[PDB]
Amino acid sequence: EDLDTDNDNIPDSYERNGYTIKDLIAVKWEDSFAEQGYKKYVSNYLESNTAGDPYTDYEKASGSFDKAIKTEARDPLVAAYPIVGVGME
Amino acid sequence: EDLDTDNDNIPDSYERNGYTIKDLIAVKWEDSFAEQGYKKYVSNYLESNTAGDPYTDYEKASGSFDKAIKTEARDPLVAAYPIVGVGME
Numbered sequence: 631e632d633l634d635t636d637n638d639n640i641p642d643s644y645e646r647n648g649y650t651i652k653d654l655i656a657v658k659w660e661d662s663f664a665e666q667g668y669k670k671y672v673s674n675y676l677e678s679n680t681a682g683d684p685y686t687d688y689e690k691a692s693g694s695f696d697k698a699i700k701t702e703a704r705d706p707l708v709a710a711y712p713i714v715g716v717g718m719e
Numbered sequence: 720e721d722l723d724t725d726n727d728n729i730p731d732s733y734e735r736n737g738y739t740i741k742d743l744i745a746v747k748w749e750d751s752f753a754e755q756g757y758k759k760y761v762s763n764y765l766e767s768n769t770a771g772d773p774y775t776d777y778e779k780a781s782g783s784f785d786k787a788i789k790t791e792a793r794d795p796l797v798a799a800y801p802i803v804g805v806g807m808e
Protein backbone atom coordinates (compact mmCIF):
# COMPACT_ATOMS: atom_id res chain seq x y z
CA GLU A 631 0.00 0.00 0.00
CA ASP A 632 2.46 2.67 1.19
CA LEU A 633 5.06 0.58 3.05
CA ASP A 634 8.66 1.11 1.92
CA THR A 635 11.37 -1.29 3.09
CA ASP A 636 14.44 -0.75 0.89
CA ASN A 637 13.94 3.00 1.50
CA ASP A 638 13.63 4.41 -1.99
CA ASN A 639 10.67 6.37 -3.35
CA ILE A 640 8.85 3.24 -4.58
CA PRO A 641 6.49 1.25 -2.30
CA ASP A 642 6.65 -2.52 -1.83
CA SER A 643 3.57 -3.65 -3.75
CA TYR A 644 4.41 -1.28 -6.61
CA GLU A 645 7.75 -3.01 -7.19
CA ARG A 646 6.23 -6.45 -6.59
CA ASN A 647 3.38 -6.03 -9.10
CA GLY A 648 4.43 -3.27 -11.50
CA TYR A 649 4.91 0.49 -11.64
CA THR A 650 5.70 3.37 -13.97
CA ILE A 651 7.14 6.83 -13.39
CA LYS A 652 5.24 9.97 -14.37
CA ASP A 653 5.70 13.50 -13.00
CA LEU A 654 8.67 12.18 -10.99
CA ILE A 655 6.44 9.93 -8.84
CA ALA A 656 5.72 6.21 -8.92
CA VAL A 657 2.20 5.05 -9.80
CA LYS A 658 0.54 1.69 -10.34
CA TRP A 659 0.85 0.25 -13.84
CA GLU A 660 -2.25 0.00 -16.02
CA ASP A 661 -2.26 -1.65 -19.44
CA SER A 662 -3.83 1.48 -20.98
CA PHE A 663 -0.58 3.36 -20.28
CA ALA A 664 1.42 1.40 -22.87
CA GLU A 665 0.01 3.14 -25.94
CA GLN A 666 1.19 6.51 -24.57
CA GLY A 667 4.75 5.16 -24.65
CA TYR A 668 5.14 4.30 -20.97
CA LYS A 669 7.03 1.24 -19.74
CA LYS A 670 6.36 -1.40 -17.10
CA TYR A 671 9.01 -1.77 -14.39
CA VAL A 672 9.43 -4.42 -11.70
CA SER A 673 12.19 -4.29 -9.09
CA ASN A 674 13.36 -5.86 -5.84
CA TYR A 675 11.50 -4.50 -2.82
CA LEU A 676 14.18 -5.69 -0.37
CA GLU A 677 17.07 -3.93 -2.15
CA SER A 678 17.80 -0.33 -3.10
CA ASN A 679 20.05 -1.21 -6.07
CA THR A 680 18.49 -4.18 -7.84
CA ALA A 681 21.07 -4.38 -10.63
CA GLY A 682 24.07 -3.46 -8.47
CA ASP A 683 25.02 -0.25 -10.27
CA PRO A 684 25.50 2.92 -8.19
CA TYR A 685 22.11 4.33 -9.20
CA THR A 686 19.06 3.20 -7.23
CA ASP A 687 15.76 1.89 -8.58
CA TYR A 688 14.07 5.30 -8.39
CA GLU A 689 16.92 7.11 -10.16
CA LYS A 690 17.04 4.50 -12.93
CA ALA A 691 13.27 4.35 -13.42
CA SER A 692 12.77 8.13 -13.38
CA GLY A 693 15.84 8.84 -15.52
CA SER A 694 17.45 11.12 -12.93
CA PHE A 695 20.99 9.85 -13.57
CA ASP A 696 23.53 11.13 -16.10
CA LYS A 697 21.66 12.02 -19.29
CA ALA A 698 24.31 10.33 -21.46
CA ILE A 699 23.32 6.85 -20.22
CA LYS A 700 21.41 4.85 -22.82
CA THR A 701 17.65 4.65 -22.35
CA GLU A 702 17.77 0.84 -22.33
CA ALA A 703 19.42 1.05 -18.89
CA ARG A 704 16.45 2.84 -17.32
CA ASP A 705 14.70 -0.30 -16.13
CA PRO A 706 16.07 -1.50 -12.77
CA LEU A 707 16.80 -5.01 -14.08
CA VAL A 708 19.40 -3.78 -16.62
CA ALA A 709 22.73 -2.52 -15.31
CA ALA A 710 24.42 0.71 -16.40
CA TYR A 711 27.87 -0.65 -17.12
CA PRO A 712 30.62 0.22 -19.64
CA ILE A 713 32.62 -2.33 -21.63
CA VAL A 714 35.54 -0.09 -22.62
CA GLY A 715 38.28 -1.88 -24.53
CA VAL A 716 41.49 -1.12 -26.42
CA GLY A 717 42.56 -1.96 -29.96
CA MET A 718 45.87 -1.40 -31.70
CA GLU A 719 46.40 -0.09 -35.23
CA GLU B 720 13.77 -11.62 24.77
CA ASP B 721 14.56 -8.12 23.52
CA LEU B 722 17.88 -7.38 25.24
CA ASP B 723 20.83 -6.45 23.01
CA THR B 724 24.34 -6.21 24.46
CA ASP B 725 26.80 -6.22 21.54
CA ASN B 726 24.47 -3.66 19.87
CA ASP B 727 23.99 -5.36 16.54
CA ASN B 728 20.40 -5.83 15.34
CA ILE B 729 20.10 -9.38 16.74
CA PRO B 730 18.69 -9.82 20.27
CA ASP B 731 20.63 -11.39 23.12
CA SER B 732 18.77 -14.70 23.43
CA TYR B 733 18.47 -15.29 19.68
CA GLU B 734 22.21 -15.73 19.13
CA ARG B 735 22.46 -18.12 22.09
CA ASN B 736 19.84 -20.56 20.76
CA GLY B 737 19.53 -19.90 17.02
CA TYR B 738 18.06 -17.43 14.56
CA THR B 739 17.44 -16.86 10.87
CA ILE B 740 17.05 -13.70 8.80
CA LYS B 741 13.86 -13.08 6.84
CA ASP B 742 12.50 -9.77 5.53
CA LEU B 743 15.71 -8.14 6.81
CA ILE B 744 14.64 -8.93 10.40
CA ALA B 745 16.05 -11.58 12.73
CA VAL B 746 13.53 -14.16 13.97
CA LYS B 747 13.70 -17.30 16.07
CA TRP B 748 14.65 -20.57 14.39
CA GLU B 749 12.09 -23.34 13.91
CA ASP B 750 12.95 -26.70 12.36
CA SER B 751 10.06 -26.29 9.89
CA PHE B 752 12.02 -23.45 8.25
CA ALA B 753 14.73 -25.78 6.91
CA GLU B 754 12.65 -27.17 4.04
CA GLN B 755 12.08 -23.61 2.79
CA GLY B 756 15.83 -23.20 2.26
CA TYR B 757 16.60 -21.19 5.40
CA LYS B 758 19.70 -21.71 7.55
CA LYS B 759 20.33 -21.75 11.29
CA TYR B 760 22.80 -19.20 12.66
CA VAL B 761 24.43 -18.93 16.09
CA SER B 762 26.72 -16.06 17.05
CA ASN B 763 28.48 -14.44 20.01
CA TYR B 764 26.18 -12.16 22.00
CA LEU B 765 29.05 -10.24 23.61
CA GLU B 766 30.82 -9.34 20.34
CA SER B 767 29.65 -7.38 17.31
CA ASN B 768 32.04 -9.21 14.95
CA THR B 769 32.16 -12.90 15.90
CA ALA B 770 34.57 -13.95 13.14
CA GLY B 771 36.66 -10.77 13.31
CA ASP B 772 36.05 -9.66 9.72
CA PRO B 773 34.93 -6.05 9.07
CA TYR B 774 31.28 -7.06 8.63
CA THR B 775 29.11 -7.49 11.72
CA ASP B 776 26.87 -10.45 12.56
CA TYR B 777 23.73 -8.80 11.17
CA GLU B 778 25.38 -7.81 7.88
CA LYS B 779 26.81 -11.30 7.40
CA ALA B 780 23.58 -13.09 8.33
CA SER B 781 21.29 -10.89 6.23
CA GLY B 782 23.62 -10.79 3.22
CA SER B 783 23.79 -6.98 3.37
CA PHE B 784 27.39 -6.69 2.16
CA ASP B 785 29.31 -6.84 -1.12
CA LYS B 786 27.34 -9.24 -3.31
CA ALA B 787 30.53 -10.78 -4.71
CA ILE B 788 31.27 -12.50 -1.38
CA LYS B 789 30.64 -16.25 -1.43
CA THR B 790 27.42 -17.40 0.22
CA GLU B 791 29.41 -19.75 2.48
CA ALA B 792 30.65 -16.63 4.32
CA ARG B 793 27.16 -15.56 5.44
CA ASP B 794 27.00 -17.40 8.74
CA PRO B 795 28.59 -15.37 11.55
CA LEU B 796 31.19 -18.08 12.16
CA VAL B 797 33.11 -18.18 8.84
CA ALA B 798 35.43 -15.30 8.06
CA ALA B 799 35.12 -13.34 4.82
CA TYR B 800 38.79 -13.51 3.96
CA PRO B 801 40.70 -13.60 0.65
CA ILE B 802 43.71 -15.82 -0.03
CA VAL B 803 45.75 -14.19 -2.80
CA GLY B 804 48.95 -15.69 -4.17
CA VAL B 805 51.33 -15.15 -7.07
CA GLY B 806 52.62 -17.78 -9.48
CA MET B 807 55.35 -17.31 -12.07
CA GLU B 808 55.20 -18.71 -15.60
Ligand SMILES: [Ca+2]
Pocket residue numbers: 634635636637638639640641642645675
Ligand atom coordinates in the same frame (compact mmCIF):
# COMPACT_ATOMS: atom_id res chain seq x y z
CA1 LIG C 1 10.68 0.20 -2.08
Ligand SMILES: [Ca+2]
Pocket residue numbers: 636638645673674675676677678679680687
Ligand atom coordinates in the same frame (compact mmCIF):
# COMPACT_ATOMS: atom_id res chain seq x y z
CA1 LIG D 1 13.97 -1.66 -4.73
Ligand SMILES: [Ca+2]
Pocket residue numbers: 723724725726727728729730731734764
Ligand atom coordinates in the same frame (compact mmCIF):
# COMPACT_ATOMS: atom_id res chain seq x y z
CA1 LIG E 1 23.04 -8.93 19.89
Ligand SMILES: [Ca+2]
Pocket residue numbers: 725727734762763764765766767768769776
Ligand atom coordinates in the same frame (compact mmCIF):
# COMPACT_ATOMS: atom_id res chain seq x y z
CA1 LIG F 1 27.03 -10.79 18.08
